[PDB]
């Protein structure tokens, strides 16, 4: 039986707010029916209006937290197998988010501050369409020295066997990422990281390459891989070759070989390990049943991690990732039914 806090994540928590809205609402906030955006000045009151005017459903969100809740869902027992750290506000949304994280059986410990509201992501649904508006807000305000470094929180890091941090968090607290990564190397534990988005490899390459030697498992997708390769001078556009070259990057913990895992949408998931590159087909090809790809990557990682914590074989970790993604992409955002049916 797994211990509590066996899986640790940290990143940018967001309160997901989903609702069926109307034309007037979309028009007021200048939203096309399938826009996916970061909030601009015109959207700062959107979340308050959304909750006042419409019946909403709330979820614990943000990329890393999504992966934690999916992992927890598939782990099932114990509750609080997955830990999550990040920054929230001292507001009603922050209280709702704490409740949702608890409902998801994740052991969330948030840094709370008063300067910024809790981050939010609105899914504004009309018919089969949905408009996404994300406001990072408090998520950008995480303070290593006021949260991670406190013993009551650091000990939860020390409880983990496996760590996962989205590369998005390199834009907020790269020193937190480095400290966790260093601990993983010092203790021969598995540290995992997502490339997260092309802009991470372009604009945050210093932090990314500072952490890379500590990465036991690098997750990403084909678009991130292409950008990473260009920025690192790999001189190839072939995804398998990119994965092989990333696998062979400098590494401090030589007790564990790096694994590089790049998803390709409906095309094969590519896995580079020490002595080979293997392609894992995506067996779910019913494209017409896909209603929303938002969170597919987060769910893939969560499914993978759910099996990794039990030292299951690579094939099983990939199978669980593909399963989780297949569930999430048939629902608005990174959500799932009460119980998993992964066998």
Ligand X SMILES: Nc1ncnc2c1ncn2[C@@H]1O[C@H](CO)[C@@H](O)[C@H]1O
Whose Cβ is closer to Cl ion: residue 66's or residue 326's? Answer: 66
DSSP assignment letter at 3: P
Q: How far is the CB of 244 from ligand X (least distance, A)?
A: 19
By CB under 6 A, residue 300 contacts ligand X: yes
Q: What is the H or E stretch that residue 278 is in? A: strand 277-280
**Could you give the residue numbers annotated as active site?**
298
What is the number of other CB atoms lying within 10 angstroms of the CB of residue 303?
30
Whose Cβ is closer to ligand X: residue 83's or residue 335's? Answer: 335
Please, are residues 133 and 122 in contact by the beta-carbon 8 Å criterion? yes
Select from 321, 193, 302 the least CA-distant residue to 258: 193
Which residues lie near Cl ion (CB under 5 A)? Answer: 11-12, 62-64, 166, 168
User: What would the two tokens of residue 343 be?
Assistant: 């066998």
Helix, coil or strand: residue 226: helix
Strands 7-10 and 267-272: unpaired
Helix, coil or strand: residue 75: helix
Please, are residues 13 and 87 in contact by the beta-carbon 8 Å criterion? yes
Q: Which stretch binds ligand X (CB under 6 A): 7-15, 139-147, 173-181, 287-295?
A: 287-295
Please, are residues 7 and 46 in contact by the beta-carbon 8 Å criterion? no
By CB under 6 A, residue 287 contacts ligand X: yes
By CB under 6 A, residue 322 contacts ligand X: yes
> Rounded CA gap, 56 and 67, in Å?
22
Name the residue number minimizing CB distance to Cl ion: 11
Sole binder of ligand X in the list 32, 42, 99, 266 (CB under 6 A): 266
Q: How far is the CB of 278 from Cl ion (least distance, A)?
A: 28
Distance of CA 99 to the CA centre of its chain: 19
Sole binder of ligand X in the list 34, 114, 202, 293 (CB under 6 A): 293
Sole binder of ligand X in the list 7, 106, 185, 325 (CB under 6 A): 325
Whose Cβ is closer to Cl ion: residue 109's or residue 245's? Answer: 109
Whose Cβ is closer to Cl ion: residue 162's or residue 166's? Answer: 166
Binding residues with ligand X: total (CB under 6 A):
15
129 is in an annotated binding site: yes
By CB under 6 A, residue 57 contacts ligand X: no
Give the position of tokens 């039986």.
1
307 is in an annotated binding site: no
326 is in an annotated binding site: no
Whose Cβ is closer to ligand X: residue 83's or residue 263's? Answer: 263
196 binds, among Cl ion, ligand X, none (CB under 5 to 8 A by kind): none
201 is in an annotated binding site: no
Question: Strands of 162-166's sheet, edge to edge?
Answer: 107-113, 82-89, 7-10, 162-166, 190-194, 217-221, 259-264, 267-272, 277-280
Q: How far is the CB of 157 from ligand X (least distance, A)?
A: 27
Q: How far is the CB of 170 from ligand X (least distance, A)?
A: 21
Select from 155, 174, 156 the least CA-distant residue to 214: 174
> Rounded CA gap, 217 and 137, in Å?
29
Q: Where on the chain is the footprint of ligand X (CB under 6 A)?
A: 263, 265-266, 269, 282, 284, 287, 290, 293, 296-297, 300, 322, 325, 329
Binding residues for Mg(2+): 30, 129
Binding residues for adenosine: 16, 287
Binding residues: 16, 30, 129, 287
């Amino acid at each position: 039986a797994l211990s509590e806090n066996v899986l640790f994540g940290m990143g940018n928590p967001l309160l997901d707010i989903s609702a069926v809205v109307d034309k007037d609402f979309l028009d007021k906030y200048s939203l096309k029916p399938n826009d996916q955006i970061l909030a601009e000045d015109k959207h700062k009151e959107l979340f308050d209006e959304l909750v006042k005017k419409f019946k909403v459903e709330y979820h614990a969100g943000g990329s890393t937290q999504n992966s934690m809740k999916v992992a927890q869902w598939l782990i099932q027992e114990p509750h609080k197998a997955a830990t999550f750290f990040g920054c929230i506000g001292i507001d009603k949304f922050g209280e709702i988010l704490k409740r949702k994280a608890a409902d998801a059986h994740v052991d969330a410990h948030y840094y709370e501050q008063n300067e910024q509201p809790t981050g939010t992501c609105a899914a504004c649904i009309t018919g089969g369409n949905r408009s996404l508006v994300a406001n990072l807000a408090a998520a950008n305000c995480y303070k290593k020295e006021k949260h991670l470094d406190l013993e009551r929180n650091w000990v939860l890091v020390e409880k983990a066997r496996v760590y996962y941090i989205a590369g998005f968090f390199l834009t907020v607290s790269p020193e937190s990422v480095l400290k966790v990564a260093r601990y993983a190397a010092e203790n021969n534990r598995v540290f995992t990281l997502n490339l997260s988005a092309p802009f991470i490899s372009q604009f945050f390459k210093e932090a990314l390459m500072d952490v890379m030697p500590y990465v036991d498992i690098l997750f990403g997708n084909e678009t991130e891989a292409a950008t990473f390769a260009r920025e690192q001078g790999f001189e190839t556009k072939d995804i398998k070759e990119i994965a092989k070259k990333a696998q062979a990057l400098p590494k401090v913990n030589s007790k564990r070989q790096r694994t590089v895992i790049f998803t390709q949408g409906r095309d094969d998931t590519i896995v580079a390990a020490e002595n080979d590159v293997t392609a894992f087909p995506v067996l779910d090809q019913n494209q017409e049943e896909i209603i929303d790809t938002n969170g597919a990557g987060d769910a893939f990682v969560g499914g993978f991690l759910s099996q990794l914590v039990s030292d299951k074989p690579l094939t099983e970790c990939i199978r669980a990732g593909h399963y989780a993604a297949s569930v999430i992409i048939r629902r608005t955002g990174c959500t799932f039914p009460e119980k998993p049916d992964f066998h």
